[PDB]
Amino acid sequence: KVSEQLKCCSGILKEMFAKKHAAYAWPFYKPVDVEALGLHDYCDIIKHPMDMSTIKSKLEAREYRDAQEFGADVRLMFSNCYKYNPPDHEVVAMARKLQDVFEMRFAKMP
Numbered sequence: 001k002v003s004e005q006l007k008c009c010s011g012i013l014k015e016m017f018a019k020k021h022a023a024y025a026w027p028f029y030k031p032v033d034v035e036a037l038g039l040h041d042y043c044d045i046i047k048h049p050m051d052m053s054t055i056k057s058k059l060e061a062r063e064y065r066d067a068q069e070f071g072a073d074v075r076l077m078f079s080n081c082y083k084y085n086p087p088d089h090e091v092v093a094m095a096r097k098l099q100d101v102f103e104m105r106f107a108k109m110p
């Protein structure tokens with residue numbers, strides 16, 4: 001059922017938070033601290049910021065109708081990173097390693 005795939009989405013997000021991915025996952029745990037980093041143009045270029053904490057809140061508040069809507073937010077998080085940053089930047093390399101974890105689990109969902 002729809003509520004079985006949303007249970008898997010929780011498991012996928014929990015995995016993305018787990019210790020074994022912590023070295024490359026941490027930049028996506030919470031909203032980009034644009035204040036502290038002095039990224040004055042970030043909110044102008046990124047219209048819909050997204051992060052794993054915001055996704056966790058939305059998932060616990062059952063604001064995702066299906067896995068596809070959860071998926072769109074995970075991919076928005078990564079797209080925001082790929083959009084703002086050059087391809088050589090360390091955060092892009094970290095995004096890709098975490099996205100690979102997401103894409104494999106998301107694809108193998110029953």
Ligand SMILES: CCc1nc([C@]23C[C@H]4C[C@@H](C[C@H](C4)C2)C3)[nH]c1-c1cc2c(=O)n(C)cc(-c3cc(C(C)(C)O)ccc3Oc3c(C)cc(F)cc3C)c2o1
Binds near residue numbers: 032034081
């Ligand atoms: C100095 C921060 C930064 N500067 C850039 C640019 C550098 C350059 C000028 C202009 C346009 C550029 C080309 C991208 C800004 N991008 C970032 C950037 C983008 C990020 C991003 O998309 N995500 C998802 C996370 C981070 C980020 C966030 C944080 C906290 C404070 C926890 O919010 C710390 C460090 C971050 O990014 C870095 C990272 C992940 C690894 C690294 F080695 C250095 C970072 C600055 C960043 O930092």
